[PDB]
Design a protein around this ligand. Structure first.
Ligand SMILES: O=c1[nH]c(=O)n([C@@H]2C[C@H](O)[C@@H](COP(=O)(O)O)O2)cc1F
Ligand SMILES: O=c1[nH]c(=O)n([C@@H]2C[C@H](O)[C@@H](COP(=O)(O)O)O2)cc1F
Lengths: 315, 315
């Protein structure tokens, strides 16, 4: 049916699997280069042979059009998609006196109560982020992240240029530019970074009164990740047509390396025996128009009917 | 046969043709998003149902690994691929007294002796570029071009970082990074530019002892252009395996907008009635190893057997 693109690309990775020792080696099957397109006029690509929580996706984009850098705005939206990159600077200097959490992702997975003592200082931290307007300001500004690279390309002669606002005055002044590309890749401070831009850039497009958006994703976690991304940018495509007043068209997801972590192989097999349902229709608050200035109540998903949620070994 | 990817992508543009009034409107058929892959181990992708001059292609890459900005090095290689962007600053201040060449591409095409009076002051200029070591230094440094964005990403705290040298110490220290991406897109001075990066970026890859390279091309001129690009980066892929000491693998060309200028429609039809020949094998000077420090005599193309050269209405 409609989500069929996504679902094929676990088939080819099985049947083309290059087995890479990468990670801490740990195990992966990859491929290199893949495009896979989606008709956004058909229905909205939320995955129906798995249950993908639409809340945490928009809670994260609305982090992104708000130009926002701060763990505090996602937390107070129950969003726990980003914690550990700013809990990486809790295990970092002073105030941090006497738990460890030294490169903790690892020993929590290979834990019993370690994951839990990490789960309790981490929690201490999260609720600081919530309540004191200065510690929060400190550990919480992640600085180079999308909200910033979207809404403030930082220049030499230290200005901030917002790629997103300019490219959509360009879709409003000039429909046909082959130059509506926003790029999250800054080579200067790419090697001073922790996680370089996964979504490297996105080109947009106006064909027949209607708009598309194309994505070069430099690395992708096929199971434990991609279902989410399909929606994050297929919802984006939907909200900037809402500001330019055009129609919706195609989300092209194009890939560089796409892999399937080998710890997950049983689990991707199963939902590939699932049979698709129809896919929901996303509809945005009509009367309001700046996507940049949207809250939560401004996107409702309707008739979404997932299969049960398949559990992580994380990624 | 091998070049068959390229040759299909004029078929789909005919049969999918979105007719865009863009240019000075002038006329185009586009599409939006396209990938098309190439097996570099099969043979080298020089087009055999048209004659594509291999000289001006490598004369231009060797402009590019030399980190070079200067019209003078290409001229003294008979390369006339870049002239008018620096002849755009001949029609610009002083010394320029008394021809016109005001936005001359146009009136030369709609000329008789205009193209020729432009062809004679332009020529005056080209041979200045050749002989006086200061005027040359002036009109000839184009500044933001590949040699510069490849070999000197210019930072805030005004350093120059060479993306190419670092990414190939990364292919030599670390085969499996999903972060070997060089990006020619600088959003700061993209809107202060004349022609923004057409080749936006390229990701590389090491699977099985062997290397691939992927290209996001943001706009492409299907007939009067693309045959050339297929070779420029499929030769690149070949020379950085020569420095990392690996094998050759795949050149993925992926596209954002690909068009076919409508003035050319008769002409693409014809070579689509041509039947492919085999494709040459490119072999590089073995004993020498820095591609950055290659001259001309360091790549020989052998057994290349084109069909005749189809003539331009330019692009
Ligand atoms: O949804 C996600 N998709 C994804 O591709 N990553 C990645 C990909 C890779 O497995 C790792 C980052 O590593 P690298 O940056 O080296 O690709 O996290 C993370 C997510 F949360
Ligand atoms: O080989 C070439 N391929 C190509 O795509 N361009 C382009 C594409 C487009 O037709 C124009 C640049 O316009 P824009 O930058 O708006 O895409 O020149 C130029 C070449 F010489």
């Amino acid at each position: 049916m409609l989500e069929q693109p996504y679902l094929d690309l676990a088939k080819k990775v099985l049947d083309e699997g290059h087995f890479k020792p990468d990670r801490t080696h740990t195990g992966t099957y990859s491929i290199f280069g893949h495009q896979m397109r989606f008709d956004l006029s058909k229905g909205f690509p939320l995955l129906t042979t798995k249950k993908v929580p639409f809340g945490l996706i928009k809670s994260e984009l609305l982090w992104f059009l708000h130009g926002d850098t701060n763990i505090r705005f996602l937390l107070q939206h129950r969003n726990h998609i980003w914690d550990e990159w700013a809990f990486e600077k809790w295990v970092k200097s002073d105030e941090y006196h006497g738990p460890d959490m030294t490169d903790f992702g690892h020993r929590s997975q290979k834990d019993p109560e370690f994951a839990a003592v990490y789960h309790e200082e981490m929690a201490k931290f999260d609720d600081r982020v919530l309540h004191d307007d200065a510690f929060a300001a400190k550990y919480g500004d992640l600085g180079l992240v999308y909200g910033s690279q979207w809404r403030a390309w930082h220049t030499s002669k230290g200005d901030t240029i917002d790629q997103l606002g300019d490219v959509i005055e360009q879709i409003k002044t000039h429909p046909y530019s082959r130059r509506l590309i926003v790029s999250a890749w800054n080579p200067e401070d790419v090697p001073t970074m922790a996680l370089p831009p996964c979504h490297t850039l996105y080109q947009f497009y106006v064909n027949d009164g209607k708009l598309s958006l194309q994505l070069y994703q430099r690395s992708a976690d096929i199971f434990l990740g991609v279902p989410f991304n399909i929606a994050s940018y297929a919802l984006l495509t939907h909200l900037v047509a809402h500001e330019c007043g055009l129609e919706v068209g195609e989300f092209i997801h194009t890939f560089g390396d796409a892999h399937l972590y080998v710890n997950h192989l049983d689990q991707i097999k199963e939902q590939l025996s699932r049979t698709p349902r129809p896919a929901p229709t996303l509809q945005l608050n009509p009367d309001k128009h700046d996507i940049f200035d949207f809250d939560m109540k401004d996107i409702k998903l309707l008739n979404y009917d997932p299969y049960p949620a398949i559990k992580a070994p994380v990624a």
